[PDB]
């Protein structure tokens, strides 16, 4: 599914991400924009053999199992394929674990490089939340 901007903002809001660990909703929408372009089915292979899955490009090296990332972990205890659903619940639940981890939203490269330190409030402008 390719979410509309406000459609995704509203979905993330009702799943409790607005100001989760201090990160305003616009940060989560911005992250999703530049990780997946709002496409729940987005996947990308990394140089080390791990793969990033879904709307927030959650990595198989640490967070989910795909059975083809040797020596990796599955800290969200879910198959990576579950992170590709049209329903963002699984990705959000996993994202909440990730962001509580240590480096916060710096765990998302696109967030750190393209959202952090910018005006993210624009990502939810005009949305019914
Ligand atoms: Cl909507
Ligand atoms: Cl293994």
Coordinates of N, CA and C and ligand atoms in Angstrom, one line a residue:
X1 N 0.8 -1.2 0.0 CA 0.0 0.0 0.0 C 0.9 1.2 0.0
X2 N 0.6 2.2 -0.8 CA 1.3 3.5 -0.8 C 0.4 4.5 0.0
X3 N 0.7 4.9 1.2 CA 0.0 5.8 2.0 C 0.0 7.2 1.4
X4 N -1.1 7.9 1.6 CA -1.0 9.4 1.5 C -0.3 9.9 2.7
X5 N 0.2 11.1 2.5 CA 0.9 11.8 3.6 C 0.1 11.9 4.9
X6 N -1.1 12.5 4.8 CA -2.0 12.7 5.9 C -2.6 11.4 6.4
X7 N -2.8 10.5 5.4 CA -3.3 9.2 5.7 C -2.3 8.4 6.7
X8 N -1.1 8.5 6.4 CA 0.0 7.9 7.2 C 0.1 8.7 8.6
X9 N 0.1 10.0 8.5 CA 0.2 10.8 9.8 C -1.0 10.3 10.7
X10 N -2.2 10.2 10.2 CA -3.3 9.8 11.0 C -3.1 8.4 11.5
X11 N -2.6 7.5 10.7 CA -2.4 6.1 11.2 C -1.3 6.1 12.3
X12 N -0.2 6.8 12.1 CA 0.8 6.8 13.2 C 0.3 7.5 14.4
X13 N -0.5 8.5 14.3 CA -1.1 9.1 15.5 C -2.0 8.1 16.3
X14 N -2.9 7.4 15.6 CA -3.8 6.6 16.4 C -3.0 5.4 17.0
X15 N -1.8 5.1 16.5 CA -1.0 4.0 17.0 C 0.0 4.6 18.1
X16 N -0.2 5.8 18.5 CA 0.5 6.4 19.6 C 1.9 6.9 19.4
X17 N 2.3 7.3 18.2 CA 3.7 7.7 17.9 C 3.9 9.2 18.1
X18 N 2.8 10.0 18.2 CA 3.0 11.4 18.4 C 3.6 11.6 19.8
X19 N 4.9 12.1 19.7 CA 5.7 12.4 20.9 C 6.1 11.2 21.7
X20 N 6.1 10.0 21.0 CA 6.6 8.8 21.6 C 8.1 9.0 21.8
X21 N 8.6 8.8 23.1 CA 10.0 9.1 23.5 C 10.4 10.5 23.0
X22 N 9.4 11.4 23.0 CA 9.7 12.8 22.7 C 9.8 13.2 21.2
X23 N 9.5 12.2 20.3 CA 9.6 12.5 18.9 C 8.2 12.8 18.4
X24 N 8.0 14.1 17.9 CA 6.8 14.6 17.4 C 6.4 13.8 16.1
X25 N 5.1 13.8 15.8 CA 4.5 13.0 14.7 C 5.2 13.3 13.4
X26 N 5.6 14.6 13.2 CA 6.2 15.0 11.9 C 7.5 14.3 11.7
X27 N 8.2 13.9 12.8 CA 9.5 13.1 12.7 C 9.2 11.8 12.1
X28 N 8.1 11.1 12.6 CA 7.8 9.8 12.1 C 7.4 9.8 10.6
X29 N 6.6 10.8 10.2 CA 6.1 10.9 8.8 C 7.3 11.2 7.9
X30 N 8.1 12.1 8.4 CA 9.4 12.5 7.6 C 10.2 11.2 7.4
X31 N 10.5 10.5 8.5 CA 11.3 9.2 8.4 C 10.7 8.3 7.4
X32 N 9.4 8.1 7.5 CA 8.7 7.1 6.6 C 8.8 7.6 5.1
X33 N 8.6 8.9 4.9 CA 8.8 9.5 3.6 C 10.1 9.1 2.9
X34 N 11.2 9.3 3.7 CA 12.5 9.1 3.1 C 13.1 7.8 3.3
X35 N 12.5 6.9 4.1 CA 12.8 5.5 4.1 C 12.1 4.7 3.0
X36 N 10.8 4.9 2.8 CA 10.0 4.0 2.0 C 9.2 4.7 0.9
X37 N 9.2 6.1 0.9 CA 8.3 6.9 0.2 C 6.8 6.5 0.4
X38 N 6.6 6.2 1.7 CA 5.2 5.8 2.2 C 4.7 4.5 1.7
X39 N 5.5 3.6 1.1 CA 5.1 2.3 0.5 C 5.4 1.2 1.5
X40 N 4.3 0.6 2.0 CA 4.5 -0.5 3.0 C 5.2 -1.7 2.4
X41 N 5.3 -1.8 1.1 CA 6.0 -3.0 0.5 C 7.5 -2.8 0.2
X42 N 8.0 -1.6 0.5 CA 9.4 -1.3 0.2 C 10.4 -2.2 0.9
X43 N 11.3 -2.8 0.1 CA 12.4 -3.5 0.6 C 13.7 -3.1 0.0
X44 N 14.8 -3.1 0.7 CA 16.1 -2.8 0.2 C 17.2 -3.7 0.8
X45 N 18.0 -4.3 0.0 CA 19.1 -5.1 0.5 C 20.4 -4.2 0.8
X46 N 20.9 -4.5 2.0 CA 22.1 -3.8 2.4 C 23.4 -4.5 2.0
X47 N 24.5 -3.8 2.1 CA 25.8 -4.4 1.6 C 26.2 -5.6 2.4
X48 N 25.8 -5.7 3.6 CA 26.2 -6.8 4.5 C 25.3 -8.0 4.3
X49 N 24.2 -8.0 3.5 CA 23.4 -9.1 3.3 C 22.0 -9.0 4.1
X50 N 21.9 -8.1 5.0 CA 20.7 -7.8 5.7 C 19.7 -7.1 4.7
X51 N 18.5 -7.1 5.1 CA 17.5 -6.4 4.3 C 16.6 -5.5 5.2
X52 N 16.2 -4.3 4.6 CA 15.3 -3.4 5.3 C 13.9 -3.6 4.8
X53 N 13.0 -3.6 5.7 CA 11.6 -3.9 5.4 C 10.6 -2.9 5.8
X54 N 9.7 -2.6 4.8 CA 8.5 -1.9 5.1 C 8.5 -0.4 5.2
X55 N 7.4 0.2 5.6 CA 7.2 1.7 5.7 C 8.4 2.4 6.5
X56 N 9.0 1.8 7.4 CA 10.1 2.4 8.2 C 11.4 1.6 8.0
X57 N 11.5 0.8 7.0 CA 12.7 0.1 6.6 C 13.5 -0.5 7.8
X58 N 12.8 -1.3 8.5 CA 13.3 -2.0 9.7 C 14.2 -3.2 9.2
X59 N 15.4 -3.2 9.8 CA 16.5 -4.1 9.4 C 16.5 -5.5 10.0
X60 N 16.8 -6.5 9.1 CA 16.9 -7.9 9.6 C 18.1 -8.2 10.4
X61 N 19.1 -7.4 10.3 CA 20.3 -7.6 11.1 C 20.0 -7.7 12.6
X62 N 19.0 -6.9 13.0 CA 18.7 -6.8 14.5 C 17.2 -7.1 14.8
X63 N 16.3 -6.7 14.0 CA 14.9 -6.5 14.5 C 13.8 -7.6 14.1
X64 N 14.1 -8.3 13.0 CA 13.1 -9.2 12.5 C 13.8 -10.4 11.9
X65 N 13.1 -11.5 11.7 CA 13.7 -12.7 11.1 C 13.3 -12.9 9.6
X66 N 14.2 -13.0 8.7 CA 13.9 -13.4 7.3 C 14.6 -14.7 6.9
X67 N 15.3 -15.3 7.8 CA 16.0 -16.5 7.6 C 17.2 -16.5 6.6
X68 N 17.5 -15.3 6.2 CA 18.6 -15.2 5.2 C 19.6 -14.1 5.6
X69 N 19.7 -13.8 6.9 CA 20.6 -12.9 7.4 C 21.4 -13.6 8.5
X70 N 22.5 -14.4 8.1 CA 23.2 -15.3 9.1 C 23.7 -14.5 10.3
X71 N 23.5 -15.1 11.5 CA 24.1 -14.6 12.7 C 23.3 -13.3 13.2
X72 N 22.2 -13.0 12.6 CA 21.4 -11.8 13.0 C 20.5 -12.1 14.2
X73 N 19.9 -11.1 14.7 CA 18.9 -11.2 15.8 C 17.5 -10.9 15.2
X74 N 16.5 -11.1 16.1 CA 15.1 -10.9 15.8 C 14.5 -10.2 17.1
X75 N 14.9 -9.0 17.4 CA 14.6 -8.4 18.6 C 13.1 -8.0 18.7
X76 N 12.4 -7.8 17.6 CA 11.0 -7.6 17.6 C 10.1 -8.8 17.6
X77 N 10.8 -10.0 17.4 CA 10.2 -11.3 17.5 C 9.1 -11.4 16.5
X78 N 9.4 -11.1 15.2 CA 8.4 -11.1 14.1 C 9.1 -11.5 12.8
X79 N 8.4 -12.2 11.9 CA 9.0 -12.4 10.6 C 9.0 -11.0 9.9
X80 N 10.1 -10.8 9.2 CA 10.3 -9.5 8.5 C 9.1 -9.2 7.5
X81 N 8.6 -10.3 6.9 CA 7.5 -10.2 6.0 C 6.3 -9.6 6.6
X82 N 6.1 -9.7 7.9 CA 5.0 -9.1 8.6 C 5.1 -7.6 8.6
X83 N 6.3 -7.1 8.4 CA 6.5 -5.6 8.4 C 6.1 -5.0 7.1
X84 N 5.5 -5.8 6.2 CA 5.2 -5.3 4.8 C 3.7 -5.1 4.6
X85 N 2.9 -5.4 5.7 CA 1.5 -5.4 5.6 C 0.9 -4.0 5.3
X86 N -0.3 -4.0 4.7 CA -1.0 -2.7 4.5 C -1.4 -2.0 5.8
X87 N -1.5 -2.8 6.8 CA -1.7 -2.3 8.2 C -0.4 -2.1 8.9
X88 N -0.1 -0.9 9.4 CA 1.2 -0.6 9.9 C 1.5 -1.0 11.4
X89 N 0.5 -1.7 12.0 CA 0.6 -2.1 13.4 C 2.0 -2.7 13.7
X90 N 2.4 -3.7 13.0 CA 3.6 -4.5 13.3 C 4.8 -3.6 13.2
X91 N 4.9 -2.7 12.2 CA 6.0 -1.8 12.0 C 6.1 -0.8 13.1
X92 N 4.9 -0.3 13.5 CA 4.9 0.7 14.6 C 5.3 0.0 15.9
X93 N 4.8 -1.2 16.2 CA 5.2 -1.9 17.4 C 6.7 -2.1 17.5
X94 N 7.2 -2.5 16.4 CA 8.7 -2.7 16.3 C 9.4 -1.4 16.4
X95 N 9.0 -0.4 15.7 CA 9.6 0.9 15.7 C 9.7 1.5 17.2
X96 N 8.6 1.2 18.0 CA 8.6 1.7 19.4 C 9.7 1.0 20.2
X97 N 10.0 -0.3 19.9 CA 11.1 -0.9 20.6 C 12.4 -0.4 20.1
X98 N 12.6 -0.1 18.8 CA 13.8 0.4 18.2 C 14.1 1.8 18.8
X99 N 13.2 2.6 18.9 CA 13.4 4.0 19.3 C 13.7 4.2 20.7
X100 N 13.4 3.1 21.5 CA 13.6 3.2 22.9 C 15.1 2.6 23.2
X101 N 15.8 2.3 22.1 CA 16.9 1.4 22.2 C 18.2 2.0 22.9
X102 N 18.5 3.2 22.5 CA 19.7 3.8 22.8 C 20.0 5.1 22.0
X103 N 20.1 5.0 20.7 CA 20.3 6.2 19.9 C 19.0 6.8 19.3
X104 N 17.9 6.4 19.9 CA 16.6 7.0 19.5 C 16.4 6.9 18.0
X105 N 15.9 8.0 17.4 CA 15.5 7.9 16.0 C 16.7 8.0 15.1
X106 N 17.9 8.1 15.7 CA 19.1 8.1 14.9 C 19.3 6.7 14.2
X107 N 18.6 5.7 14.8 CA 18.6 4.3 14.3 C 18.0 4.3 12.8
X108 N 17.3 5.3 12.4 CA 16.9 5.4 11.0 C 17.8 6.4 10.3
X109 N 18.6 5.9 9.4 CA 19.5 6.7 8.6 C 18.9 7.8 7.9
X110 N 17.7 7.6 7.3 CA 17.0 8.7 6.6 C 16.5 9.8 7.5
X111 N 16.1 9.4 8.7 CA 15.8 10.4 9.7 C 16.9 11.2 10.1
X112 N 18.1 10.6 10.4 CA 19.2 11.3 10.8 C 19.7 12.3 9.8
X113 N 19.7 11.8 8.5 CA 20.3 12.6 7.4 C 19.4 13.6 6.8
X114 N 18.1 13.4 6.9 CA 17.1 14.2 6.2 C 16.0 14.9 7.0
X115 N 15.9 14.5 8.2 CA 14.8 15.0 9.1 C 15.3 15.7 10.3
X116 N 16.3 15.1 10.9 CA 16.9 15.6 12.2 C 17.3 17.1 11.9
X117 N 16.9 18.0 12.8 CA 17.4 19.4 12.7 C 16.6 20.2 11.7
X118 N 15.6 19.7 11.1 CA 14.8 20.4 10.1 C 13.4 20.6 10.7
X119 N 12.6 21.4 10.0 CA 11.2 21.6 10.3 C 10.1 20.6 9.8
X120 N 10.0 19.6 10.7 CA 9.2 18.5 10.4 C 7.7 18.7 10.6
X121 N 7.4 19.8 11.2 CA 6.0 20.0 11.4 C 5.2 20.1 10.1
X122 N 5.9 20.5 9.1 CA 5.3 20.6 7.7 C 4.7 19.3 7.2
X123 N 5.3 18.2 7.8 CA 4.9 16.9 7.3 C 3.5 16.5 7.7
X124 N 2.9 17.2 8.7 CA 1.6 16.9 9.2 C 0.6 18.1 8.9
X125 N 1.1 19.2 8.3 CA 0.3 20.3 8.0 C -1.0 19.9 7.2
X126 N -2.1 20.4 7.6 CA -3.4 20.2 6.9 C -4.1 18.8 7.1
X127 N -3.4 18.0 7.9 CA -3.9 16.6 8.2 C -5.0 16.6 9.2
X128 N -6.1 15.8 9.0 CA -7.0 15.5 10.1 C -6.4 14.4 10.9
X129 N -6.2 14.7 12.2 CA -5.5 13.8 13.1 C -6.3 13.3 14.2
Ligands
LIG1 CL1 -7.0 9.1 6.4
LIG2 CL1 21.9 -17.9 11.5

